[PDB]
Amino acid sequence: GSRKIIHVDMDCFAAAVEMRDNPALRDIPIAIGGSRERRGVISCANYPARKFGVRSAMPTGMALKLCPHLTLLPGRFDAYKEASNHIREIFSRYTSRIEPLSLDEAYLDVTDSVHCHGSATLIAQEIRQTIFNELQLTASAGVAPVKFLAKIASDMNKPNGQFVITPAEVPAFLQTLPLAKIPGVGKVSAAKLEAMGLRTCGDVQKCDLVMLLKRFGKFGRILWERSQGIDERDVNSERLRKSVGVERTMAEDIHHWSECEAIIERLYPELERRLAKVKPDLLIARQGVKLKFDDFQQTTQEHVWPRLNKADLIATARKTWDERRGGRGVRLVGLHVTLLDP
DNA sequence: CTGGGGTCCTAGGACCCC
DNA sequence: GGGTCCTAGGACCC
Ligand SMILES: Nc1ccn([C@H]2C[C@H](O)[C@@H](COP(=O)(O)NP(=O)(O)OP(=O)(O)O)O2)c(=O)n1
Ligand SMILES: [Mg+2]
Ligand SMILES: [Mg+2]
């Protein structure tokens, strides 16, 4: 039923806002991540740092081994939040059909738009431009008839570029497209798929659908459909936050309950403030806790609960601390609430 | 040498209904 | 024998 979807993605979003504000970081390797002393990971890295192999979700310990002159910045969320809200208002000028996927990211449906005539290519081009003129940062775009193809397209000519995929180009695009580039196919599934000899969508096009439903369930249908180019998901501008969590990893494993309670005492005020901005009465559906151990196993305990309550969080945290710790060190403790169904 | 914020999926037992 | 809720956990995303 061919639609036209624009996936915009900010390039090096967190880093780019650090460089715009201080140009001294424009041409030196910078990353936002948090110290190796605090056991942190890289969240964003500029291209000078990317040249050394620094990627997002990489432990800072390895980021420094690869690029020792990394200037690590901690990040200013409100600086990135304002930029985003500006980005989303720039989208508001071309369609109401806007589905943000994060701060730096949004699906735009422009099928029924009158703007740069009907050219999804020129709308994406002008949005990418207006962002630069108004925020001095750069965007990439992808244009496709479906959601995931427009997302894959947003990475192909980045940074500061776009890439269009028309319906006639789709069959050739999918034939060589490796399965792991499909959003929702990460490291584990890509490894089993390659264990079955499935690397590209061209390979799964020659597969049996009932076979894939046997082995992967609902995931096998999604797999088989994306390879045929099928992605009926609508751009939904109505999607709502469903949960609020606050967690913290300490410098080193903590071994006594006394220390773990000292962390919850600090975590709770932050969780309440962030819950208050969205729900002033603090009324919720479930609240609970999370511990992650030295062997990186993690357990959570959540239960029905009417209102964000600190003592019950401490209480339940010691029940896990006793029943499921088994004497290992603890590197992370976290708090959580599940919001009420709208 | 492994973050912090989330979404979505699965699955067994409890629970309720015929 | 059905269905929805409850809970824990895992894969995945930015
Ligand atoms: N694992 C990750 C991935 C992204 N992020 C944050 C930091 C990024 O600046 C922001 C943008 O997500 P992203 O698109 O995946 N990466 P980024 O936009 O910075 O670089 P490119 O999109 O140009 O590849 O999300 C994170 O905190 N942890
Ligand atoms: Mg980006
Ligand atoms: Mg993004």
CATH fit for domain A1-21+75-175, picks 3.40.50.2300, 3.30.70.270, 3.30.565.10, 3.40.50.9100? 3.30.70.270
Q: A38 CA to middle of ligand 1, Å?
A: 21
Give pairs for A169-173: CB < 8 Å, separation 24+: A170/A144, A170/A145, A170/A229, A171/A229, A173/A149
Ligand index nearest the alpha carbon of residue A15: 1
- Measuring from the CA of residue A65 to each C1' atom, give the nucleotide at the shortest distance: B1
Atom 16 of ligand 1, residue of closest alpha carbon: A12
- C-alpha A67/C-alpha A46 separation (Å) is 12
Kindly report the three-state secondary structure assignment for every residue of chain A. Answer: CCCCEEEEEECCHHHHHHHHHCHHHCCCCEEECCCCCCCCECCEECHHHHCCCCCCCCEHHHHHHHCCCCEEECCCHHHHHHHHHHHHHHHCCCCCCEEECCCCEEEEECCCCCCCCCCHHHHHHHHHHHHHHHHCCCEEEEEECCHHHHHHHHHHCCCCCEEECCHHHHHHHHHHCEHHHCCCCCHHHHHHHHHCCCCEHHHHHCCCHHHHHHHHCHHHHHHHHHHCCCCCCCCCCCCCCCEEEEEEEEEEEECCHHHHHHHHHHHHHHHHHHHHCCCCCCECCEEEEEEEECCCCEEEEEEECCECCHHHHHHHHHHHHHHCCCCCCEEEEEEEEECCCC
- C-alpha A310/C-alpha A299 separation (Å) is 19
Tokens 């959003």, residue located: A183
Show me where the domains of chain A are located.
1-21+75-175, 22-74, 176-230, 242-342
Query: What single letter denotes the amino acid at residue A248?
Result: R
CATH 3.40.1030.10 fits A22-74, yes or no: no
Give pairs for A74-79: CB < 8 Å, separation 24+: A74/A32, A74/A33, A74/A34, A75/A14, A75/A32, A75/A34, A75/A43, A76/A17, A79/A17, A79/A21
- PDB experimental method: X-ray
Comparing C-alpha atoms, which of A256, A239, A260, A236 is closest to residue A315? Answer: A260
Report if CB A277 to strand B is under 7 Å.
no
Residue A283: strand pairing partners: A307
Tokens 């000519």, residue located: A157
Domains A22-74 and A176-230 share a fold: no
> In sequence order, which residues have a C-beta less than 8 Å from that of residue A129 and are 6 or more positions away?
none
CA end-to-end span of chain A, whole Å? 31
Residues A20/A137, Cβ–Cβ less than 8 Å = yes
Q: Cα separations (Å) of A56 from A15, A62, A100, A105?
A: 11, 11, 20, 16
Å separating the CA of residue A223 from the C1' of nucleotide C12 = 14
> In sequence order, which residues have a C-beta less than 8 Å from that of residue A339 and are 6 or more positions away?
A241, A242, A243, A244, A278, A279, A284, A285
Ligand 1 atom, smallest distance to A12 CA? 19
Which of strand C's nucleotides are less than 7 A from any protein C-beta?
Answer: 6-14
Residues A59/A27, Cβ–Cβ less than 8 Å = no
- Residue A258 has φ and ψ, to the nearest 5°, of -55, -45
Largest CA distance in chain A: 66
Residue A32: strand pairing partners: A44, A73
Question: In this complex, which protein residues place their C-beta within 7 A of any atom belonging to strand C?
Answer: A 56-57, 101-105, 151, 182-190, 285-286, 288, 297-304, 324
Catalytic residue among A37, A82, A89, A105: A105
| Angle in degrees, 0-180, between the axes of helices A310-323 and A257-276, rounded to the nearest 10 | 140
CATH class of the domain comprising A176-230: mainly alpha
- C-alpha A222/C-alpha A238 separation (Å) is 23
- CA–centroid distance for A247 within its chain: 17
A105 is catalytic: yes
Resolution number, Å: 2.4
Comparing C-alpha atoms, which of A101, A126, A125, A96 is closest to residue A111? Answer: A96
| Lateral strand order in the sheet of A71-73 | A44-45, A30-32, A71-73
CATH number of the domain located at residue range(s) A242-342 in this protein:
3.30.1490.100
Ligand 1 atom, smallest distance to A158 CA? 23
- C-alpha A61/C-alpha A41 separation (Å) is 8
Q: Answer yes or no: is the C-beta of A11 below 6 A from any ligand 1 atom.
A: yes
Comparing C-alpha atoms, which of A80, A19, A27 is closest to residue A51? Answer: A27
- Measuring from the CA of residue A14 to each C1' atom, give the nucleotide at the shortest distance: C14
Cβ burial, residue A341 (10 Å; 0-12/13-18/19+): exposed
Residue A41: strand pairing partners: A59
- CA–centroid distance for A290 within its chain: 20
- Measuring from the CA of residue A102 to each C1' atom, give the nucleotide at the shortest distance: C14
Residues A69/A29, Cβ–Cβ less than 8 Å = yes
- C-alpha A248/C-alpha A225 separation (Å) is 39
